[PDB]
């Protein structure tokens, strides 16, 4: 072969040379001692990471059993838990403990904001992140539907001033709302100047300071014509620049440009559900990109320097330029042919994520060609999805114990956000989090796995409702809120983030603003946008809803019961009439084409999908999870037939085909539907569905896409 032997493995020369060439200088790794720590790591975890993934099999398997030899139509839930508790899927609440995590950054313990998550094989969308922590409002506002298009301020080719006036105004009214005057608006502002340390704004009758004056935190230029004024509220910074010389400014009664806006504190790098990576030269696309943005060189056009402000009192001050960067690695689960042992057997991916993204980030806890890069704490922040109860968070914490060793790193730098988007994490998460008592820095609600979990492990209890009909369910709200209380209870307030879910729909920013408001209302630090527009946006909720005083309010309250947890989202009888039954189906055999399409044939795991009405969705590999389950569900119970389901199959295609003509790429799976692997990945999701492990679309995903790219190959 073209792989290189070291011990039990062989790994990829790509692979190989990636971590020897480019990866381990300049971390003082000895690269013989780094590769015997690989294959020692992976000997010794391996068979206990076997025997989770095997224990996951015996529960449901359990659990399947449970529901079919039982005819009684109202469940018991006395009856259901017993039996969870009996066979180890609802283990014991462990006594109330605060969390000890130490050494980890101001972005994650205190402050409340965004976090941005993409895909890291996407180096310019990276990048875009990485810069996300500052955005500009105006952009944001005029670009979007928040300042609806109605007539006269639509968006044209060039500047309407109709539209950029109700985007100034819609700003000044932010001014108003976050950061007040002590008398009249910043709409009848007609200057700023900085006098004795204190902020002047001029109006047109009168001066006046802020309401509290401690809100001021800087500016730049010179004190009695600054360039611009620098704020904060609930942590975060807000910057209203002046130049009436610019071509909003000069249209401006104080001058102002615009108002920039902290934005994506933190980033996650994406490992996993947003990209396709199916092999070592994937791997290896993915890894150098992460390198690039820790070592601070990574140019698709660079990574922001920090930026530069004079405090009130005249001093010189800094704040940070850069998004602080977690990486997404992947679960338990998959393998990948990236290394191999002896027998030929695929090395657990996981594993090695954890090895390679950990020894990459080494490069951004120092000084890049510039300052460090990354955390000036010392933390590396690693995102572990897709784990199933305690014993998976341990073994995961012990996993990064043995890497910390082969990196010569200090026990616990490496730090876990754990994702509770599993049904046997949700009902023990006090638990989960105590296995990382002293590593854990958020808990974060990945809502679209969750219920892709709920329906494949209820299964066989009878037809689940409608797709739409999840994210009112009452599993669902007591599964968030049963977060929120977990993290609080443990002590995250001041030390960790208390995280909750992705916002999808990319085009409906009016919709965002308006609704996602919720989350930091309901007592979370952070929450999930998919796009830097996005993340400025979200931002404001986090100045209109004080996240702190939420949380303290929401202390020792118990807002769900197990009971409300274990609620399985079964249909009523007789719910759906004949036309909603085909138009439940078309729609989810369009948002499975529509999302496998791109990832089989391009290797694209995230962008954004029209959905069969048209809306731009942006989601995840979990999306796809929820939808085959949900078909094999109602295929499983005798809602819809097999023929309904190839009908609807062959339907949607030609829409979805349609829907990509504006790309170069893209190959159309209609007519010929059995040349496309694309469109057999969609009908092998749905048919072998029931049969996944928890319902996982990668086993399928990654076989199909291997297929695609040796075909491609000839
Ligand atoms: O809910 C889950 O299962 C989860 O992992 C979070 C979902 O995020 C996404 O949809 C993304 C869209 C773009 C980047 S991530
Ligand atoms: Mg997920
Ligand atoms: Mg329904
Ligand atoms: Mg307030």
Redesign the pocket.
Known sequence: TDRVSVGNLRIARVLYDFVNNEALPGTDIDPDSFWAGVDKVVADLTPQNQALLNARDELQAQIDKWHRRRVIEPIDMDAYRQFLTEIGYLLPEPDDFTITTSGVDAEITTTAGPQL???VLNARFALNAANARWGSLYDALYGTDVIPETDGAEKGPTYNKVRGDKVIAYARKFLDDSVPLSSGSFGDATGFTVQDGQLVVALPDKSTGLANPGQFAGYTGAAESPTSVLLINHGLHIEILIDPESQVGTTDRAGVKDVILESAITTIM?FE??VAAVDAADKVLGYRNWLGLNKGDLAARVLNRDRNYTAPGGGQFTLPGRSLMFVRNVGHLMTNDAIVDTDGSEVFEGIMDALFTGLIAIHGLKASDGPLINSRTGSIYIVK?KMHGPAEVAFTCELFSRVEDVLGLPQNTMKIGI?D?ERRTTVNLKACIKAAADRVVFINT?????TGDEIHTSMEAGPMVRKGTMKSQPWILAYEDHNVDAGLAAGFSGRAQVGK??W?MTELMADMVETKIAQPRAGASTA?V?SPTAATLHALHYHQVDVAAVQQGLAGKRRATIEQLLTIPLAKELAWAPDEIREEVDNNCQSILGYVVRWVDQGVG?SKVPDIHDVAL???R??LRISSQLLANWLRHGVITSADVRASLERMAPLVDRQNAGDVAYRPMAPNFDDSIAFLAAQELILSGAQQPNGYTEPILHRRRREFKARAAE
């Open positions: 998550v993409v895909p994406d559900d947003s999805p994702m988007e990945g809502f679209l796995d969750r879910g992705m999808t999930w998919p995230a942006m989601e995840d979990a999306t």
